[PDB]
Amino acid sequence: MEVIELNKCTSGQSFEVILKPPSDPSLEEIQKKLEAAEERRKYQEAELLKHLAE
Amino acid sequence: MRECISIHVGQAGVQIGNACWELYCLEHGIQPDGQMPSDKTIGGGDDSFNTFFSETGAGKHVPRAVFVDLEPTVIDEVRTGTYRQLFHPEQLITGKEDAANNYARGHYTIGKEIIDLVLDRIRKLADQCTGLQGFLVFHSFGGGTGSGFTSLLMERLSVDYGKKSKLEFSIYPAPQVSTAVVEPYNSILTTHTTLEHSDCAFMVDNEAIYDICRRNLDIERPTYTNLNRLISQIVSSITASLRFDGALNVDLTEFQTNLVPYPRIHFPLATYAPVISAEKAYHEQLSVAEITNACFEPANQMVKCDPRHGKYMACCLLYRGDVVPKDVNAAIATIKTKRSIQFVDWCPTGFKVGINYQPPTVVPGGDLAKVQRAVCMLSNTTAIAEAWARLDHKFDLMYAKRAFVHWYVGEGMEEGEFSEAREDMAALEKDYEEVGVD
Amino acid sequence: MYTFVVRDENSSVYAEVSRLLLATGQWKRLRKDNPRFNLMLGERNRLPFGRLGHEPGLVQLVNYYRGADKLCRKASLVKLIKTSPELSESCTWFPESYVIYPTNLTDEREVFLAAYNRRREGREGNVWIAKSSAGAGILISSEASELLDFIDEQGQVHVIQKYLEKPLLLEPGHRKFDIRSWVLVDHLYNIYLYREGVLRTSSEPYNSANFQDKTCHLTNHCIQKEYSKNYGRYEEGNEMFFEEFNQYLMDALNTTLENSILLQIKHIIRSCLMCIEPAISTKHLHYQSFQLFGFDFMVDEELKVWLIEVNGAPACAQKLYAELCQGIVDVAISSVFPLAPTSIFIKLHHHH
Amino acid sequence: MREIVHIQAGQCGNQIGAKFWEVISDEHGIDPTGSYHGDSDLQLERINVYYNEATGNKYVPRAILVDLEPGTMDSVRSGPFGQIFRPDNFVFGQSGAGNNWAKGHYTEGAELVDSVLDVVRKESESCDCLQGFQLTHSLGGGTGSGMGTLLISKIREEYPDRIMNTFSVMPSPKVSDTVVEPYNATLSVHQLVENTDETYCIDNEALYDICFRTLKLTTPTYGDLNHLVSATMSGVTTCLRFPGQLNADLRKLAVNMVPFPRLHFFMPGFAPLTSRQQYRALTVPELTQQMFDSKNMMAACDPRHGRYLTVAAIFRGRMSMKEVDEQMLNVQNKNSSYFVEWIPNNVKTAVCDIPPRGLKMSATFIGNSTAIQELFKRISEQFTAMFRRKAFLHWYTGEGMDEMEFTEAESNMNDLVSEYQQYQD
């Protein structure tokens, strides 16, 4: 049971109590992901319009 | 002084942001018009509260915040509510139609079209900062925007602000206050693509907030207002060290150092006390020991789980009110001889304690009663994995039938992203089990 | 209407409890994966406690205390006793035991050998028994070399404990025996002892000059019925109930089962359960637990009771299923989900 | 500002649509002239969802009245609220559809569809952000069934990413006009399977049983049957017409109610259904017990024959929301064998303070249940009984249709029944 790094100021204080010692995707890659899904949407919609035109 | 930019995404993020910035103003003595008589430096200053508010020449203290929602109804309340005067219009971004509770719709379909605008607005706030620490991102797991657009925002933020810390406040889906059936899907999808981008995340289970409002506040059917005022108290307790003079958790960097030794396991459990009804004739003020002992009662946790059957990696006690180190260390000695606090052998068995003498502030007319001292314990427990296991299980039930998957594929998402996200969760659960169980 | 699910088809006990529940016309059984249940008769291993108590509007109850394995595992029990101040290392009702890991994997090998050398030097009876949890595999011997070399042949943790060389032998026969007590702990953590115990007697005469034949030394109901030649001679199924055993103690030892054996049994039951209550209690928890426990005891010729082990998923004596099972329904299930005596249990009061 | 464009086609569609606008106009305080005279701001909060605002604070429904003969629409214009509809939004012919799906879809209807789309485009152009469409029609006739599904097909082509919603009246021999109704209903169902996100199934046979047995109406009429449809249409749209957060958007509703794209046919329900003992107060338990009772359902399918995929209840009026959850959670927990266990929390409740006219409180039920396969089974059997003899086909082959098209509609619906059966297990 020890207290360490006790810091006191006007608005409070803080300290540490120890009981026992121990024993990314680039901007380009994000544009591709976004554009890939946009493309898949464009494909599905064209398949709908192709179906409707038939 | 280093600045902190708050970001609120979706309905949950925006309504919780509203509740917090209301609480911040009451705490710093800021009025609805942005005026702060205590600030003797007009239109400038590098004080502690300046980490969250900038200043104009006219004395207006403007939150360093950005609200984003794909539909405008929730943000219009901000534009006309009590604190309309705090923000200028560029800080409130609203779209025309939301993500329909569809992750794919918010991340891909709509997110692709609005992402560059949001970053531009955030870039404006960054340009007012002399030393930006990082960001605080509030959002829900279940919403289409909260899950979908947030994970996109975190990806870009890591690209545009590589050396900046990002902390999350995430609302874990609870059926008692939701009508969306696909929320397990959204939650797991957003956790997967956000994991490598978030440095520390405080999950709040709506089921926990709900039951605390029924048990401790006598709210038979709590509303979002009831939930958000309680959630903003825990948020204030967590962010207080950034906004006031102190020495513990003085910058976003310190949250990871003190709470996250292993990067993927960055979901600390939060426990708050006391929550006392205001309608009570008059309550007996709880002692440092009693409220500290309450930090180990599952009933006061932001996520219902049993820490008795996990292992601790860190623990911080953030006190506010009439508290002195003499009383704190005393109650801790008594709680070790009674409680089941098992630490991991490669972490020091101890507690970091922060005390702020200003007791908790309560919104006038709110549900919470003024108390002389309160505490918030941030502990990193393997027990919180119970929440992933639950959420992951509901995912497995629907995905076994491919139920609702077509709505996501229809927005341009590949089905393999489901399984890729689920396999990531399976490994996250395994990380907790390898660190906690024997 | 109350609903329940069954996730352990092998449990003879709760198989009867489920039959009793359905007999009241007030309990409905759902598929074992339906989350909307009031009562879970759960699985033995890896029961997912984390998913209990999250269904809105449902008070959910389970028949296992999460964490009670610390008491029902061989090595865990020894560690619990040596480490728990409530039980201490000097506890006078638990045989001297040590946790010994096979060398192919802390361990108490040295500590065990110093105590072994201490006995061998002081002319004292130095007979130990090595056992584990992965058994049907048990060994008895007076040489430490045979005990250690046996555990290394295996691959799981074992425990070495002092063998009771002076057991109490029933006459006629001169035969060993153990005592099984059934204990039920409810959601409020009341400790109820079933008034009906069972002595699983060895139908073979005890023999201290030959531990090679483990038929008169092990009183297991499965060994006496597979490797014993006098099975069912003195008592049907090598099972003597309290009514009989009590009369024997009177005619032979001029004492009663309550005074000479039961007072100690009740004391041990209280000590173990109270010790772990803070760790496993579901008082302030989002779900509720109850559980049936099987305590095994040994009695020496001095009428001092010793604790053998604790079973988390015990079976019941055939003649006592209806009474005990119905009792579980009464105080464990209906006490939380009531329906529209002379109790069979003995409540062991204690300070919570 | 999430506007919905309303289309009503054919006799049934225009008469049910008529009473609908009459019922909701009352709830929003709009009189027959379009002038608002309510006393609660909740009436105007979401008023633009179904109404346009003209000069002088006039509220004009966003509805298009379509038919191939003038009869029914002359009545609407002369009916109670006939004055409230935009005169331009009346689009009709003189030929009629002769209860013939082919005439509505391929011949007569084709000559008229372009002018209808010109009106649909005019209403959409003035929409701030268009949610989607909703169509009222029957499937047993010619205009609503044949031309109605044609309009849907052409609306989806021009507005592919907008929700398409319908209130569809299913034919029944108990309330039948002609024997070819199975032909017309089977041809439409396939169109709806492909081109609608949500179809509220309204079985005239169920409406009959409710009027005869529960409501004790000796000799029910189409007017009486339409009182229930009006009341049900008001309930299912309460989420859209008043301030709410649960199922408040057409796309959000579709997302939580449709686990699979083809299984989007809902069973609606309403409570109370009282016979004139009509002033007694209805308790929350009674609202729930009745709302979930088959006798209160309009699809004419016994739910206990299948399983609910998703459920959406809406309670209207001032009541205990705590006691609402207590009774809803009591129905699920007392009949969990009829709710699929592989969709966690598939029953959602929504409360509304404003009750329907003349009622202290009510409840509307919306179920996506596999039991609906019984309704499609009935239609299929009546179709095959005639089609195996090619009876009455000349009415259709004389309009350019071929037998192969009928054989395909047959296989299509029988596939739909099979798809329901595999999820009921």
Ligand SMILES: Nc1nc2c(ncn2[C@@H]2O[C@H](COP(=O)(O)OP(=O)(O)OP(=O)(O)O)[C@@H](O)[C@H]2O)c(=O)[nH]1
């Ligand atoms: N605690 C809390 N939770 C909220 C609040 N608002 C919504 N939620 C939760 O958020 C989940 C739904 O996600 P939302 O945030 O409403 O949806 P969204 O982020 O706006 O995304 P969209 O689908 O486009 O509307 C549900 O589980 C709600 O319980 C709130 O104000 N407070």
Ligand SMILES: Nc1ncnc2c1ncn2[C@@H]1O[C@H](COP(=O)(O)OP(=O)(O)CP(=O)(O)O)[C@@H](O)[C@H]1O
């Ligand atoms: N230290 C000891 N001294 C004397 N006898 C002992 C003993 N340890 C075990 N025994 C004998 O072994 C038997 C119990 O074995 P144990 O209970 O450890 O194995 P087990 O757990 O597989 C049987 P169960 O769990 O069903 O009671 C008893 O009959 C007892 O006589």
Ligand SMILES: Nc1nc2c(ncn2[C@@H]2O[C@H](COP(=O)(O)OP(=O)(O)O)[C@@H](O)[C@H]2O)c(=O)[nH]1
């Ligand atoms: N519920 C209801 N059903 C109707 C009404 N009018 C017609 N029907 C049913 O609709 C079918 C006839 O279609 P109808 O609308 O008259 O043909 P259309 O005018 O060419 O579209 C039959 O099944 C009738 O029972 C009505 O006012 N209410």
Ligand SMILES: CCS(=O)(=O)NCc1ccc2c(c1)OCO2
């Ligand atoms: C025994 C009562 S009833 O059969 O007359 N009422 C139902 C009904 C109403 C209108 C109908 C119809 C049937 O067939 C054509 O139009």
Ligand SMILES: [Ca+2]
């Ligand atoms: Ca200043």
Ligand SMILES: [Ca+2]
């Ligand atoms: Ca980073």
Ligand SMILES: [Ca+2]
């Ligand atoms: Ca012509």
Ligand SMILES: [Mg+2]
């Ligand atoms: Mg939203």
Ligand SMILES: [Mg+2]
């Ligand atoms: Mg055993």
Ligand SMILES: [Mg+2]
């Ligand atoms: Mg007609």
